[PDB]
């Protein structure tokens, strides 16, 4: 046992030394030689109403028009952002929903929470009403996040410190991801869907392989649990958000932090993080009731999206990048442009 | 300017809004309470008796008493980082806490069961998300306590205890120790009750506590109290 522990410590030291040896230059030094972006002004265009409870999760559609939001009242609402009209209202069998997902094709949606079960609903039934298609049971903890890989399979995250890939038609998880010391909080899919990353309460982010089912890479440096994670538009990097009031940008190739986004006066945690279409701007939600836009290449603050009366829990940018939607615990969802 | 199909979509959205409003109005009239405690503390017995009077995850129990609807949530089976989902219960009307009175001389793999129960009660009561949430405490194993106290002294659990070994004094000491864990007595109050094989009084006590909490909340809303 002692020999194995010493070997593990030596391997960790070697990995740290290898990572340090290649830190020849920093992103900030190189990016100092470009003109910064000016003050970003965003005015709310639509204020979606109809939810009578806290908003916890939301996902933008591929068409960049339809979006789905989850609330604690047990109702899933599909909103037409262009006209604000409600498309569907799905009553959840369990009101304790903590996450929701929208399929790339828009045929099915997913949700889950403290019930430890992920439910799939069909939006294109010949019956004309939205009904649950399959239920993905087997997790020993509350569902944290879920994302649709394709019409056939879905990847979900749970609080039992493990993530699994579920085959909708089969109903049985085909791959199980293990290695996280803390509860897994968020998931993000790469643009090519080849790889995905997950954040856990152990303040570390891990890189997983869809088919191999093994952790290729690990990330560390956060001083608190990670709650948000999102891939860079290029797909070679991602950013994470924790409760220590700092956002860290991690790139898959360097296996080290590139730049840190934080402000002295902010002492609250970070709920959600998202990237612009081109990746030039970084948007993160904070518990102080407003969203802050961060200069990705310079870490300078670009603007503030204020107006929410409660904690900002979720946000997302459209596929085309035309507008960004933000959710909050006051039951109101706003779209900014 | 809107087309016929757009007008139909608007009408459908308005109908959905009306349905959501009706559902919210229906749901706002049900009292939501949270139940906490250890598996052997008597949670199962309490749930069974209340259900009679009227797999992994959380158990939902519905019961009605005096034309008032109650919703009970059990999170005992959900062993995980509770502070990551405890905030989901901010709107809980009241919290039900169950502790076994006879577990003072038993051991758990804190070392003592009662010390762990007191620590859990202290953590839940002082939680930042339960500033104005009242707490109800139920003692489920007083009948076994009657026999156990007459043989095993209470000094094992509380070395500082120096009062008489009589049943009433021990029960009063336990109640006072449990109550003293409150730091915000002005903002919130604790309701204590003793449970046994008899179950008629438990529901009445719960209803009275819920009514008092609702009355106090409405007084706060009106500005009084």
């Amino acid at each position, epitope marked *: 046992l002692d020999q194995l522990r010493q070997e593990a410590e030596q391997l960790k030291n070697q990995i740290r030394d290898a990572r340090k040896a290649c830190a020849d230059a920093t992103l900030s030094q190189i990016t100092n030689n470009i003109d910064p972006v000016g003050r970003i002004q965003m005015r709310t265009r639509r204020t979606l109403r109809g939810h009578l409870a806290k908003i916890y999760a939301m996902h933008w559609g591929t068409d960049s028009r*339809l979006l789905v939001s989850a609330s604690q009242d047990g109702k899933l609402i599909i909103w037409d952002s262009y006209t604000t*009209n409600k498309v569907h209202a799905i009553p959840l069998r369990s009101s304790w929903v903590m996450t929701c997902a929208y399929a790339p094709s828009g045929n099915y949606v997913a949700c889950g929470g403290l019930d430890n079960i992920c439910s799939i609903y069909n939006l294109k039934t*010949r019956e004309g*009403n939205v009904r649950v298609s399959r239920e993905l049971a087997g997790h020993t903890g509350y569902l944290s996040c879920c994302r649709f890989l394709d019409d056939n399979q879905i990847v979900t995250s749970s609080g039992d410190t493990t993530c699994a890939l579920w085959d909708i038609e089969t109903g049985q998880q085909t791959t199980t991801f293990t290695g996280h010391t803390g509860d897994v909080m968020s998931l993000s899919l790469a643009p090519d869907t080849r790889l995905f990353v997950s954040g856990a309460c152990d303040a570390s982010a891990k890189l997983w392989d869809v088919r191999e089912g093994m952790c290729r890479q690990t990330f560390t440096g956060h001083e608190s649990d990670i709650n948000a994670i999102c891939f860079f538009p290029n797909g070679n990097a991602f950013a994470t958000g924790s409760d220590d009031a700092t956002c860290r940008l991690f790139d898959l190739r360097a296996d080290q932090e590139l730049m840190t986004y934080s402000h002295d006066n902010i002492i609250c945690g970070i709920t959600s993080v998202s990237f612009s279409k081109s990746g030039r701007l970084l948007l993160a939600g904070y518990d102080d009731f407003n969203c802050n836009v961060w200069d990705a290449l310079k870490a300078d603050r670009a603007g503030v999206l204020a107006g929410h009366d409660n904690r900002v829990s979720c946000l997302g940018v459209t596929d085309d990048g035309m507008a960004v939607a933000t959710g909050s615990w006051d039951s109101f969802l706003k779209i900014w442009n | 300017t809107l087309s016929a199909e757009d007008k139909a*979509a608007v*009408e459908r959205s308005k*109908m959905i809004d009306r349905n959501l409003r009706e559902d919210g109005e229906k749901a706002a009239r049900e009292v939501k309470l949270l139940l906490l405690g250890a598996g052997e503390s008597g949670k199962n017995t309490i749930v069974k008796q209340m259900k009679i009077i009227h797999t992994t995850g959380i158990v939902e129990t519905h019961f009605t008493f005096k034309d008032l609807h109650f919703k009970m949530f059990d999170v005992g089976a959900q062993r995980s980082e509770r502070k990551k989902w405890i905030h989901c219960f901010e709107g809980v009307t009241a919290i039900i806490f169950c502790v076994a009175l006879s577990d003072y001389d038993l051991v758990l793999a804190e070392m003592n069961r009662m010390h762990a129960s007191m620590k859990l009660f202290d953590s839940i009561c002082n939680n930042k998300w339960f500033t104005d949430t009242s707490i109800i405490l139920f003692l489920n194993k007083k009948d076994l306590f009657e026999e156990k106290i007459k043989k095993s002294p209470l000094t094992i659990c509380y070395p500082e205890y120096a009062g008489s070994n009589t049943y009433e004094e021990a029960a009063a000491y336990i109640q006072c120790q449990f109550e003293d864990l409150n730091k915000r007595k002005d903002t919130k109050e604790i309701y204590t009750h003793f449970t046994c094989s008899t179950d008629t009084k438990n529901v009445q006590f719960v209803f009275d506590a819920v009514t008092d909490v609702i009355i106090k909340n409405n007084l706060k809303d009106c500005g009084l109290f």
Partner: single-chain antibody
Amino acid sequence: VQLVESGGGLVQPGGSRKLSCSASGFAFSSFGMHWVRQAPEKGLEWVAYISSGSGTIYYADTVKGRFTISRDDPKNTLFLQMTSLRSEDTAMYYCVRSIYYYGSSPFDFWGQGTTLTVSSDIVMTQATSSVPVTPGESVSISCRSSKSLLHSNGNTYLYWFLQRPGQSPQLLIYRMSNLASGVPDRFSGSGSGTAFTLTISRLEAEDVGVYYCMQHLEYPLTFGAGTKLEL
């Protein structure tokens, strides 16, 4: 999903009849209903429409006031109180489903219908009435409207319906080239503003029928003359 209309037969001009349609296999409450007439050897013509919840009702100019329509969600039955009758009222009545939301496909399902015998608006026209052609060869059908169907929202309200012999009309394309569910990829629609055309990659024995072009930009709904394919 099935619709069974009831009522019909010989009715005197001075009499009255009440038609009933039974809806099953779908959420009738959330689906709007339409009535379409089809006189012998004639084209289709919209009659009335009811939105979900009976909040909106429309009638054609030739039937306004005369005809009363009612809805009964609990029983999933649709009624048509047909108070007065003239000679021209003789025609087959078809019940059509309709649901209106983003991405929806209204007029997707058409009921079997019933036969009843009795003892400004946008003009839709189709130049071609009969287009004989052998199987396999591509066939094109063109329809035109007197007013542009392109709304400011960026979509054109045009529909294509195919009625095979002894069968009710079946939706093919809606607003205005999207393929209806359950239809082969052979059919394709195109157009611009006012000129539209329906093209088939290869004709099969199952494609024999009459094609109707319908507009939904504004009420009352108008149906084209109809083009028949034969071999």
